[PDB]
Amino acid sequence: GSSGSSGSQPLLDRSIPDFTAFTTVDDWLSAIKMVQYRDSFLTAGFTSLQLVTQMTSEDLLRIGITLAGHQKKILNSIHSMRVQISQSPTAMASGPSSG
């Protein structure tokens, strides 16, 4: 038939959510519509976002999350999380002996 016409390309997200408005996995996931994986992280051992901030796409496939379309959202959040919360700056630096 003659339906399904779009006169515009897929733009990006200009509006950014509040990364500094979380506290727990159940809450965080619920803020990204990914609450469905609230048990995947819980049982996996990741009860605090502080532990998820140091995770990766691999960890998602380890707990069960194997949806490329879903991981795109999680990682997109985790990356911004570690940056905002959890102060984990560079470690391996400076001279071999200083103090």
Give the position of tokens 């605090």. Answer: 48
Q: What are phi and psi of 48, to 5 degrees?
A: -115, 140
CA–CA separation, 55 and 49 (whole Å): 10
Q: Do residues 74 and 34 lie in contact, with contact meaning Cβ atoms separated by under 8 Å?
A: yes
- Assigned superfamily of 23-82: Transcription Factor, Ets-1 (1.10.150.50)
Maximum C-alpha span of the chain: 74
Tokens of 94: 């400076």
Q: What's the chain look like in SS3?
A: CCCCCCCCCCCCCCCCCCCCCCCEHHHHHHCCCCHHHHHHHHHHCCCEHHHHCCCCHHHHHHHCCCCHHHHHHHHHHHHHHHHHCCCCCCCCCCCCCCC
CA–CA separation, 13 and 95 (whole Å): 42
Tokens of 47: 């009860």
CA–CA separation, 54 and 9 (whole Å): 34
